[PDB]
Amino acid sequence: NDPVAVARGLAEKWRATAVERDRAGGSATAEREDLRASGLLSLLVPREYGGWGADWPTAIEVVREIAAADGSLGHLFGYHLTNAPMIELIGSQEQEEHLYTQIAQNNWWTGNASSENNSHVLDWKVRATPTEDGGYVLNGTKHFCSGAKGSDLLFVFGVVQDDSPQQGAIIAAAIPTSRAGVTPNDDWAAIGMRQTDSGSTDFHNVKVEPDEVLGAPNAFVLAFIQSERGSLFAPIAQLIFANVYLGIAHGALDAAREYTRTQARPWTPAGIQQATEDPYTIRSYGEFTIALQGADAAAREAAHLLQTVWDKGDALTPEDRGELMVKVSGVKALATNAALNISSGVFEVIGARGTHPRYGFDRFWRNVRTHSLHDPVSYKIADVGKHTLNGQYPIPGFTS
C-alpha cells in the first residue's frame, strides 16, 4: 500500500467540494480530519517509529497530488512535512525518538509560528525569558502562523531580548498546542489559500519545558553560517512550495481540458465547428503542457538531489548544500511562472461562461498568486545568476 495511491483517493473526494469550500473560506476541519484518518501525517517518519519511511521524491508526488485537488491542503500538508525534520535537523537523539513516535501513533498535525509583521522579515519581536530550570516563557504575537490552528504540535520560534548578551538568540521549540496562553486566532484571510490557517497566534506567558526546547539557543543561525544539516531547512521548504504550484497548475490544466472537451463552444465567426479542433486552442494547450513538462522535469531531478544530500546527513558540505539550493531556487522560479501563466491563461480556452462561480476556475490562480509572494521570486532568480556567473552560493537562511 503506497501513499500516492492513498493521496489519489483523497483527491477524488475533495474535488467535489473544492468550489464550495474555496468560496466559503475559513478552516477546513473535515478535510484535515480525512487526512489524519489516511495516516499520511507520518509520511516522512521512519518505519521504526511507526511511520511510512518514504523518501523525499515519493513524498513529493503525494504533495503534488493533494495540491492538484486543493492548493490550500497541498500547502497545509506541505508545511506539515517541513516541520518534523527540524527535530532531527537540530534536536537531540532523545527528542528524535520521543517526538517522531508521538506524532506517528497519535497522528498529530503540526504547525509553526515563526514569521511576524513589524519592520522587516529579519525582525522577530517575541520575547523568551530564560527560567532558572532551563525553560523559556514566550511573550508576544505572530502573524503568518502556517497551519497553527487546529494542530496538535506547534513548532514555535522566539528571541531573547534584554541587557544580557543574548541579543538575536533565536530559540526553537516544539510544544503542544494546548499549552496555557497560546491562542491561534481565526483572523486568517487572503485572496487565495483561504483554508491554510496562516493567521496570528498570541502568546500570553506560554511556558516551554527543557525537553521541548529544540537545540541550543541560536542553534539555527549557527547551522546556517556553518552550512550544516540544519541549513537544509530552506532547500526542503522551497522544493515543496514549488511542487505545490506545479500541482495547482496540473489541476488547472486538467480542469480546463475537460471543460474544453464538454462545455466550450467553437468561435463560429472564424468558421470553426469544433472547440477541440481550434488551432489556437490546440496551440495554447501545447504551450501549457510544455511549460509544465520542463518545470516538472527540473522538479523531479531536484528531488533526487535533495534525497542524495539528505542521506549524507552531517557529512554534507557547503558545496552540496549550495548547489542544491541553486537548483531548488531554479525550480521555484519555473514553478511560479508556469503556475501563474497556466492558471491565468487557462481562461483563454475556457471562455466567458467559465467565469461563473460554480466552476471556481479562478481558485487555481488565486492560490498560486497568494503563496508565490511568500518569498520574492526575483531573488530566487538572482541567487541562480550569482552562481551561474560567479559561483557564489546563496547565504543560508530561512528561505535562501
Place this chain on the structure above:
Amino acid sequence: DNDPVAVARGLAEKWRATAVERDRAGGSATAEREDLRASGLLSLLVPREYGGWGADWPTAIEVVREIAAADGSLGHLFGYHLTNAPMIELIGSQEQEEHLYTQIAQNNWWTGNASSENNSHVLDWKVRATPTEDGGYVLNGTKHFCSGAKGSDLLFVFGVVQDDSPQQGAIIAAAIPTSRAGVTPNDDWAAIGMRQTDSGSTDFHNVKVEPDEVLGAPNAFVLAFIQSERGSLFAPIAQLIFANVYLGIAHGALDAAREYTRTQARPWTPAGIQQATEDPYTIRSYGEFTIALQGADAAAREAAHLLQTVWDKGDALTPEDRGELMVKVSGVKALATNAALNISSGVFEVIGARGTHPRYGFDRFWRNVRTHSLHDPVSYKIADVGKHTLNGQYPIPGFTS
C-alpha cells in the same frame, strides 16, 4: 467649455473609499449609477443641439478610461452605455435621432441593451419578433446575457423574425422604454469579475415595439455589415471601448500598486536591502508595467482619432476606411488585453504577501480584466491583423469584428 474628464476624476476619488467593499459585495451598484446620472456624463456623446455634451470619441474615451481605473464594472457599464445611442445614427432615421437623443439628454437616461448573440446562429437567438400590420413587432423570449438592462431607462433590443415570411431570419433593432410591459431585467448576473456590470438576463413577454421605435428596415444591421456602411462601425466602437476599459483597470492596478509600495511594502532584508522603493528588481517591474502600458495607450489614442476620422466621414465612409479601422482596433484590443492581464497579475510581485488581504482587494483588477477579456477570443483579433498584414484581407464585418 465644461471639463468632462475633471468630473470623472471627482467621482473616482469618491468611489475609491468604497471600491473594495462594492467588489466583494457584488450585485448592482445603484448608488454609483446615480452619481453618474447626477454628474450629467450620461449625455457625453449626445450632440449639443439636443442638450448633450457634444464631445468627440477621444475625449469620450478619456472619461471612460478614468472611470474604469477606479472601478472595472462601472467603467464597462458606462462604456457600454455610450455605444447604445450612436446605433440610432448608424441605422435609425433623422426623426428618431432628434427625438431619442433629446429624451436621453434632457431626462438623463441610462441605456442598456439586449442586442446581439454574437456566437449564436440568428435562428437560435432567444428573442423572437412577430410582426404586426401597423409596422411594429411583438417580442417574446429570454436573452441569456444583456448589458446594463437592469436599471436602464431606454433599452436597445434585437429580435429575430422566426416565422414564415420574407422577413424570416431578419434582425430587428428597437429602442424601447425599459418599463415597457413585458420587459423584466433579472438580477441574475454572477462572475468572478465585472460583478456590478448588471450583465444578467432580461425576459420579454409580449413586449410591443411601436413603428417609430423600430431602427431602420428589417435586417438593417446585417445589410450594413455586408456593405461596410455606417452600421458596420458597431464592432469598431464596442471593441475600442473594451480595450480602453482594460487599459483603465491596469492604470488603477498600477496606481494602487505604486501607493502600496511607497507606504506599506517592506524591503527584502536578506538581500541587504534598506528600502522597498530602492529595490532594483521592483524598480524594473514598474518600468516594464509602465512601458507595456505606454505602448498600448499610445496605440489606443491613435485608434480613437482614426475612429473619429471615419465617424466624421458619415455615410460616405468606404469599406477601406472601416476595414483599416477595425484592423487598428483589433490590434489595440490585443495590446490592451495582454498588458492588462500582465500588469493586474504582475503587480502582486511588488506588493508582497500582506497585500493578498481582502481589505486591500488588489485582485479585483485582474478578476475584472480576466472576466471581460473572454467576451470575444483575443486569438482571432490577433489573427485578423495577421490576415491583413500578410494577405491584405479585411475582417468580415459583424458584431465582434
Place this chain on the structure above:
Amino acid sequence: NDPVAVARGLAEKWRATAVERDRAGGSATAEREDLRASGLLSLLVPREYGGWGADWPTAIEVVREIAAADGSLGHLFGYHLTNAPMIELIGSQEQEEHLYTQIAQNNWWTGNASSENNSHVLDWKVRATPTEDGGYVLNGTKHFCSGAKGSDLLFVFGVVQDDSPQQGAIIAAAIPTSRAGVTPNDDWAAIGMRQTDSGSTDFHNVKVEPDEVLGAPNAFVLAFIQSERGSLFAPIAQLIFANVYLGIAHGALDAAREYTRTQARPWTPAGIQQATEDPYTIRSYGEFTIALQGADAAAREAAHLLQTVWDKGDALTPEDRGELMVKVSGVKALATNAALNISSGVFEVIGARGTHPRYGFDRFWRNVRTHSLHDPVSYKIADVGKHTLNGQYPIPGFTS
C-alpha cells in the same frame, strides 16, 4: 573507453579555431577526420558488430559536448548517428550484420539523401526504376543532403513513379557514396550551420543492388501507418536536434560568462562598480540558466523514455511510440525557444565591443536560427496540444 571524455578532448582542440571555421564556411574536413580517428563514428553500433554499443543517453551527451563547441559538428555527427539505426529499423538481419560491421571496422562516415519532408510522394526528385534482378536505378537531384559530401555509406530514398503496380512506393537504400552516378555537390550555404555539408546531391542512373535495399518497397511508409519499430526515426532524429540546440545554448552561455567576468565594463552612470555585481546582468544570467535547467531536465527524461521504447523491440505498441513522440515534440520546442532566447539575449550582458567578429559571438544564434527551421516548431507544439486535449497521437512520418 569514455566517449564523453573523448568528445571533451575534441572540443578542447577545436575551440582554438571555432571562430575561424564559422567565418570560412565550407567543409570542416580536418575536424571531420578528428571525429573518425577518435572512433566516435561507430558509437551507436553494438559491440558484437565492432562498435561502442553505446545507449541513447550516452550518445546524446556526446552530441551535446560536440554541439557546444561547434554547432555544425554537432548536427553533422548527430545526423550521422540516426542513419545507421535505419538498417535495424526496417532492414533485415543479414544486412544488419553486413552493413554494421562494414561501418564499424572501416570507421565510416554516413550521409543522407533520404526523405523530402515537405513533398508529396509523387513529387520527389530522386526516382527509382525497378530492375529485373530485384534492384533499383536512381535518377534525380535531392537538394538537402546532410553529410553526403565526404561520406562512405549514403542513405538514399527513391520513389517509383510509373505505370507499375508498385506506383509511388518509397525505396530506402544504403549504397556506397562512390557508386557510379553519385555526385554530392559542394553548393551548401547559409547564415549558420555553415559546415554541415547539407548541399544537393545528384543521382544519374545509380545502381542499387538487391541486397542494398532496406526492407520491402514502401517499408517506411507501412511502418509509419502501423507505428512499427520503423516509426522510431522521427523521435530519434528530433531528440538529437533538440540536444544540438541545447548544446549550442550552453556554448553561448559559457562564452558569455567568460566575457562578463573578464572583459565587460560596469555601467557607472548608474553607480555600478563591477559588471559582475550588476543586478540586471545577474538577473539575465539567472533566467538563461533557469531556461536551460527546465529544457535539459526534460530532454534527459525523454532519452530514458527513448531507451525504454528502443529496448522493447518489435513489442513496442502505437501507444509507446505516440507517448514518446509527444514528449520529444515538447523537448524540441523547449530546446528551440531556450537556445534562441539565450544565444540572442547573451549579447545584452556582453556589450557593444563583443560584437567584433574575432569573438564570433553571433555564431551560436546563427546556427540554431538556421536548423530550428528544419521542421516547424509551431507543429511540434500543436502535436503536444492535440495529445493533451484530445488524446490524439502524432501522425507518423519523418518529422513526427
Place this chain on the structure above:
Amino acid sequence: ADNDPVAVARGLAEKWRATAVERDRAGGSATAEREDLRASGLLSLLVPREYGGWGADWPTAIEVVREIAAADGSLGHLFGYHLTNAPMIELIGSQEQEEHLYTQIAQNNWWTGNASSENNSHVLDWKVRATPTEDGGYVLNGTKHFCSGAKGSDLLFVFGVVQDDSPQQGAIIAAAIPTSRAGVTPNDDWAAIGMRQTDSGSTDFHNVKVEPDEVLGAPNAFVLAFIQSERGSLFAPIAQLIFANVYLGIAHGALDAAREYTRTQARPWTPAGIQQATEDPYTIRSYGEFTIALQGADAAAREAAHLLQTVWDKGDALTPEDRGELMVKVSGVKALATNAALNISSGVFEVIGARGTHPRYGFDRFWRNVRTHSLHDPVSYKIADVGKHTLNGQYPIPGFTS
C-alpha cells in the same frame, strides 16, 4: 528644400534596397550611398531655412530616419547620428557658432561625425587629454573608439578632457573641427556582426589644435547644462529617440522582407494538410503578433516625437520637469523599439523557413544590425529609469544617454 523630405528619402531607400544584400556581406564604408545622401540635400534637414536648410520639424526628420533605416540599418544610423551631431552647436554654442556652422553645413552639404566614446575601464572614464592654449583653444591627444561617421565626414564633433593647473582641471570640452585638421586620423578599422557600414572605428588625435571659436560653450558646458537640465541636456532625448526609430525602421524592413518571401517562396507544411503558406494559421498568428508589437511601439515613438518638438520649441524656457518627463517617455520608447525589433528580426525566420537561410537573401542582416546597436547603451537602465519615475517621481540623471 521645398519638397517633402520623406518622399525624397523613400527614393533613396528604393535605390539602396537593390544593393542592400551585397553591401551588408561586403561591409566597409558606404561611400556611394553617403554621396547619394549628400547630393539629395537632406544633410541640412534640421538646419533652419535662414542658414540655407530645410527647417523640418522633429517628427518629419524622424520619419526620414525610419525610412532610410528600413532599407539599410547602417545608413539610418549614420544619418540619424548626423542629425544629433548638428544640434550640439545651438544646444551649447553661441549665436555666432550657430549662424556660421549651420550655414556652412547647408551650403556645403557637410557630412558630420563624432569622436566621443573611448575604450577605457568604463564609459565615464575618458583619457583623451586637452591641453589649453593662451588663445583660448586646446590641443588634443589620445584615441577615440566608436567614431560613427568620423571617416569621410567634413566636420568632426570631438569631446576632450582638460589637463591644466586651474579650476578647468577635469572639465569636458565640446568642439566642432574640420575632419582634415592636422593630427586627426580617422581609422578604417570598424568591424562588427552588424551595423557594418557605420564607420564606427577608432580616431587618433596627435597634437590636434582646437581653435577658440571652434570650442562649443564654456569649459564643462555640457556637464553644467546636464545638471541644470537646461537646453543642452536635450542631447540624450534626441539621440535616444532617433536610435529607437532606427530599430523600428529595421523591424519594418525585416517584416516587409519576410512578408514578401512568405508570399512568393515559402511552402506550406503539407504534413499538417496546409494548402498554401499564406493560409497557415500559425504563420497568420506570427505576422499578427509582429504587427501588433510594432503598432504599439510606433505609436509610442510618434507620441514622444511630438513631445520632443513641444519641449524643443520652448527653447530656454524648458524646465527640469519638461526635460525629465520627455526623457522618461523616450527611455520607454527605446525599450519598446529594442525588444520589438529583436523579437521580429529573429522571429521572422519561423515564417520564412529553411531555404531563406541562404546568404543571397541576407535575411539575418536585420537582426545583426539591431542586435549590434541595441548594445549602444543598456536597455535595462532605460527600463529602470522609467521605474524610478513611476514609483518615486524621480527623473533620470541627465547625461549623454539619459
